[PDB]
Amino acid sequence: AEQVHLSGPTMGTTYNIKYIQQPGIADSKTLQTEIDRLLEEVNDQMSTYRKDSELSRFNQHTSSEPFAVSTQTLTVVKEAIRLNGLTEGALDVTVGPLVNLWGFGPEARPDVVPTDEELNARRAITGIEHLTIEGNTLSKDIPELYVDLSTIAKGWGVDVVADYLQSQGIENYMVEIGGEIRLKGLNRDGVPWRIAIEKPSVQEIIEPGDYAIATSGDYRNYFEQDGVRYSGIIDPTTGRPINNRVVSVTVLDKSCMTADGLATGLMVMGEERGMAVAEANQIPVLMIVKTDDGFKEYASSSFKPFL
């Protein structure tokens, strides 16, 4: 088969799109110009790094009056609220002020650790309860609420590009943005698209079929000294970077937006409560956990068939 590869910058990372050419398909340059327009739009709606994005303008809004947003932004926020419910508070897109405090957002930070008083002041302006939606509108009940969609708008971008390839008659694709992946159909060799799971480096290749895959963390954090764990993933209950022994969480779901949110959420819950949610909701999840004698893999019932 003829496999076409498109690549470009978005969201402070890169995209890689592979697809199998077919008779009557639009040319690669037409498709790429539209892919770049759609991804610029995801950035102009939902990038916290763009001061004039819809999301940043909501973040700068001080009043509790409903703030009108695009249907795309509303869809992503609506899914973040549903995932907050599913992960019992662990996925909370209102931790923006803590993400920024700890040095993982657009805010310029020193290498000095926040004081207890600085940390408690940011914790006070976080909580999913401050955020409500109504039609294509968002509302904040405290002026300083800062919503961060970094954990989910990446998967959303993958879904937008995958829907656009489907809309152009392309049934055989891999869409990847910053390691968030969506697959359909068959690769160059007429086999199901191949993905590697990295283990403490050791690589197992799986075939998810028609599915999205998201991973939080990677294998390398396993080799780091003991000490306060370095992480851009915040535990909303402590206001601090997570400090559990979960190395990586991989999730499969038909939506890449959903996989991306779940992988981060279940990682925050930790393996005992995270694997119970995965079992209760038939989520395909693979967790790598660090132990004293090495690492453990926990595969959910619905992940095991891919191994």
Ligand X SMILES: Cc1cc2nc3c(=O)[nH]c(=O)nc-3n(C[C@H](O)[C@H](O)[C@H](O)COP(=O)(O)OP(=O)(O)OC[C@H]3O[C@@H](n4cnc5c(N)ncnc54)[C@H](O)[C@@H]3O)c2cc1C
Binding residues for ligand X (CB under 6 A) = 11-12, 42-43, 46-47, 49, 91-93, 95, 99, 104, 148-151, 153-154, 178, 216, 232-234, 236, 260, 264, 268
Could you say which of Mg ion, ligand X, none residue 127 binds, taking C-beta under 5 to 8 angstroms by partner kind? none
Q: Which residue lies nearer to ligand X by CB, 185 or 232?
A: 232
Q: Which residue lies nearer to ligand X by CB, 172 or 264?
A: 264
The pair of three-digit structure tokens given for residue 165, joined into one six-digit string: 């390839």
Q: What's the farthest any 2 CA atoms get from each other in the chain?
A: 63
Could you say which of ligand X, Mg ion, none residue 257 binds, taking C-beta under 5 to 8 angstroms by partner kind? none
CA distance 96 to 98: 6
Shortest distance (Å) from residue 191 CB to ligand X: 27
Could you say which of Mg ion, ligand X, none residue 285 binds, taking C-beta under 5 to 8 angstroms by partner kind? none
CA distance 84 to 261: 9
Q: Which residue lies nearer to ligand X by CB, 28 or 43?
A: 43
Q: Which residues of 182-219 are buried (b: 16+ CB within 10 A; e: fewer)?
A: bbbbebeeeebbebebbbbeeeeebebeebbbbbbbeb
Q: What is the DSSP letter of 15?
A: E
Q: Which residues are annotated as a binding site for Mg(2+)?
A: 151, 260, 264
Count other Cβ atoms within 10 Å, centred on residue 136: 15
Q: Which residues are annotated as a binding site?
A: 151, 260, 264
Q: Please identify the residue of the shown chain whose CB is closest to the bound ligand X.
A: 12
Could you say which of ligand X, Mg ion, none residue 123 binds, taking C-beta under 5 to 8 angstroms by partner kind? none
Shortest distance (Å) from residue 157 CB to ligand X: 7
Shortest distance (Å) from residue 172 CB to ligand X: 25
Q: Which residue lies nearer to ligand X by CB, 3 or 50?
A: 50
Taken in order 183, 169, 27, 161, is the CA torsion positive or negative? Answer: negative
Shortest distance (Å) from residue 46 CB to Mg ion: 13
Could you say which of ligand X, Mg ion, none residue 93 binds, taking C-beta under 5 to 8 angstroms by partner kind? ligand X
CA distance 201 to 219: 7
Shortest distance (Å) from residue 215 CB to Mg ion: 8
- DSSP class per residue in 111-173: SSPPPHHHHHHHHTT--GGGEEE-SSEEEESSTT-----TTTHHHHHHHHHHHHHHHTT--SE
Q: What is the DSSP letter of 186?
A: B
Site residues for Mg ion per CB under 5 A:
151, 154, 260, 264
Secondary structure of residue 211 in the 3-state scheme: strand
Could you say which of ligand X, Mg ion, none residue 70 binds, taking C-beta under 5 to 8 angstroms by partner kind? none
Shortest distance (Å) from residue 180 CB to ligand X: 6
In the chain, which residue ranges form alpha helices assigned H by DSSP?
28-46, 54-60, 71-86, 96-101, 116-123, 153-167, 256-269, 271-280
Q: Which residue lies nearer to ligand X by CB, 216 or 300?
A: 216
Q: Which residue lies nearer to Mg ion by CB, 59 or 87?
A: 87
